[PDB]
Amino acid sequence: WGGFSVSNPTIQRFFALHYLVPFIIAAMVIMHLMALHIHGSSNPLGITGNLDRIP
Amino acid sequence: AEVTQLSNGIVVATEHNPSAHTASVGVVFGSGAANENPYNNGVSNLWKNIFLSKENSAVAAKEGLALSSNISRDFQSYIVSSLPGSTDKSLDFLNQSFIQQKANLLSSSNFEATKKSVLKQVQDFEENDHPNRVLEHLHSTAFQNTPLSLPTRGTLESLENLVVADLESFANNHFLNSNAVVVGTGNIKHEDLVNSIESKNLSLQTGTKPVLKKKAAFLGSEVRLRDDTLPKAWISLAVEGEPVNSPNYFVAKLAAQIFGSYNAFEPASRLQGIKLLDNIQEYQLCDNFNHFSLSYKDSGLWGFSTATRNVTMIDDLIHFTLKQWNRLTISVTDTEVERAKSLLKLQLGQLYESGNPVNDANLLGAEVLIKGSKLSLGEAFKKIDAITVKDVKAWAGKRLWDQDIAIAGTGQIEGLLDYMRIRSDMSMMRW
Ligand SMILES: CCCCCCCCCCCCCCCCCC(=O)O[C@@H](COC(=O)CCCCCCCCCCCCCCC)COP(=O)(O)OC[C@H](O)CO
Numbered sequence: 001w002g003g004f005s006v007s008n009p010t011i012q013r014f015f016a017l018h019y020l021v022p023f024i025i026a027a028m029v030i031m032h033l034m035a036l037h038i039h040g041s042s043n044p045l046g047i048t049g050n051l052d053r054i055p
Numbered sequence: 056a057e058v059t060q061l062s063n064g065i066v067v068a069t070e071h072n073p074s075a076h077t078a079s080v081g082v083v084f085g086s087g088a089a090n091e092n093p094y095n096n097g098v099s100n101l102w103k104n105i106f107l108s109k110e111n112s113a114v115a116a117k118e119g120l121a122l123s124s125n126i127s128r129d130f131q132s133y134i135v136s137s138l139p140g141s142t143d144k145s146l147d148f149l150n151q152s153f154i155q156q157k158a159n160l161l162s163s164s165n166f167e168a169t170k171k172s173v174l175k176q177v178q179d180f181e182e183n184d185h186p187n188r189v190l191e192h193l194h195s196t197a198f199q200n201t202p203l204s205l206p207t208r209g210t211l212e213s214l215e216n217l218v219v220a221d222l223e224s225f226a227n228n229h230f231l232n233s234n235a236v237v238v239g240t241g242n243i244k245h246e247d248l249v250n251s252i253e254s255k256n257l258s259l260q261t262g263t264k265p266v267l268k269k270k271a272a273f274l275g276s277e278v279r280l281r282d283d284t285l286p287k288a289w290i291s292l293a294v295e296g297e298p299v300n301s302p303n304y305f306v307a308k309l310a311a312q313i314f315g316s317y318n319a320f321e322p323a324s325r326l327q328g329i330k331l332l333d334n335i336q337e338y339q340l341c342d343n344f345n346h347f348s349l350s351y352k353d354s355g356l357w358g359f360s361t362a363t364r365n366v367t368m369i370d371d372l373i374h375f376t377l378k379q380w381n382r383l384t385i386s387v388t389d390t391e392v393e394r395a396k397s398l399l400k401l402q403l404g405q406l407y408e409s410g411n412p413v414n415d416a417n418l419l420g421a422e423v424l425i426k427g428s429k430l431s432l433g434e435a436f437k438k439i440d441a442i443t444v445k446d447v448k449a450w451a452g453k454r455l456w457d458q459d460i461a462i463a464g465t466g467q468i469e470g471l472l473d474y475m476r477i478r479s480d481m482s483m484m485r486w
């Protein structure tokens with residue numbers, strides 16, 4: 001918390017980290033899409049979907 | 056060689072050729088697979104087999120002659136080949152076969168034997184012959200609910216629902232004097248011209264062929280017969296063509312001939328042709344090409360066929376073929392047109408110059424049942440030479456640019472995009 005008080009460094013670092021964390025969001029979402037593309041998608045029927053597919 | 060015409064109740068045609076010495080005379084009917092409802096499909100095939108089945112012994116015993124048959128879409132032909140000096144015997148046998156009397160030829164045991172033989176033959180065709188199967192399926196899917204789509208051999212379930220009534224009904228309703236000619240191909244001069252027309256030596260049952268409520272149609276339907284047991288994948292494409300007796304027949308034929316055929320397993324086929332051959336040779340995609348331009352009395356079918364051992368490469372092959380078709384309608388070099396014209400001249404020369412009397416008789420009957428007289432080869436060559444780049448470009452723009460297409464396939468078709476990706480590739484590209 002940048003000491004017992006609040007000054008410029010505290011709010012500045014808070015704004016910087018709110019700016020930065022969504023970049024980690026983007027990277028981990030890239031990982032999420034990679035895993036999705038590797039493993040495919042499920043179906044509402046809860047059954048195998050390899051029988052038919054469309055682009 | 057020359058063509059003659061005359062008529063009295065019936066039509067008689069003859070194309071004498073003294074070089075050959077195999078005279079063939081037979082009748083041709085303008086009613087085949089296109090004049091039969093889906094519930095009566097194999098009646099023409101049963102007729103063909105029942106004239107090829109039993110009296111084939113009598114023809115070889117009493118005389119000497121080999122009798123053939125052919126049904127393609129509407130041209131039910133029964134040719135009777137013979138020697139140059141023995142044509143009257145063939146004509147007499149043909150008369151004793153058709154006009155009187157067919158009761159002996161229609162018996163229970165003979166019909167049952169013919170029925171089981173036809174069932175075995177159609178089952179064998181449906182099992183083995185894949186490209187013909189996909190062609191028939193393309194026909195059956197392009198002309199949905201129209202007397203032009205049902206196959207020419209008869210669907211399996213349709214055979215066993217007709218015995219003697221349907222066959223005789225077809226005989227009484229289509230074997231008439233209005234849509235029948237008597238070809239005379241071979242080396243016969245004037246005996247055919249006189250003996251065909253007689254006081255009573257002509258087919259009985261004067262009348263008229265029943266009219267058809269529906270003429271034809273063409274809608275873009277897709278059909279797939281996916282099954283992974285087969286090793287290869289056969290797919291065919293098509294568009295709307297032109298009927299016979301239209302001023303676009305030879306332009307369409309030239310457009311088909313422009314891309315031609317191909318065979319990867321022949322050293323003489325990988326080094327000629329046009330661009331898509333070069334684009335394909337780099338990766339082993341396809342094996343066979345068949346650019347066909349079929350035409351019937353109602354409508355035509357200008358298409359494409361192939362067969363690939365590779366299964367992942369189907370999409371690339373289809374895309375390249377469609378891209379080349381797209382390029383055809385915008386920019387074709389005059390050299391391409393000249394080469395296609397020469398190749399088509401050679402192809403038609405081989406087609407119409409073969410020494411087989413039966414094939415010449417079939418072509419003569421086919422071209423006389425629609426127009427009235429055969430279009431001679433010299434005039435055909437002249438009008439082929441009349442074609443230019445402007446005419447073929449105009450025809451391609453009219454009948455290919457963004458037009459409805461029909462697709463068929465069987466085998467390993469897991470990698471084929473269904474209908475929108477293929478259709479979109481004719482106009483989405485930059486033009
Ligand atoms: C919610 C998910 C998406 C979010 C947003 C995505 C953002 C990225 C977008 C990436 C591109 C998608 C935008 C639309 C692309 C249209 C389709 C396309 O271009 O691809 C075709 C590619 O098409 C071609 O190859 C021919 C057309 C292109 C030639 C003409 C180019 C004109 C000028 C293009 C300018 C843009 C250049 C860059 C293009 C990426 C595939 O179809 P096909 O014609 O090949 O048919 C399939 C066939 O069976 C196999 O080929």
Ligand code: HEM
Pocket residue numbers: 029032036040041042043
């Ligand atoms: C917040 C950012 C996210 C993005 C951009 C994202 C994106 C996607 C995409 C594109 C898919 C494929 C199906 C679809 O389009 O929905 C998907 C599927 C899925 N996601 Fe996410 N996702 C996100 C977050 C999450 C989270 C937080 C969870 C945790 C519960 C989650 C769980 C799943 C699951 C279980 C599927 C499976 C759907 C299927 O069966 O394909 N996702 N996600």
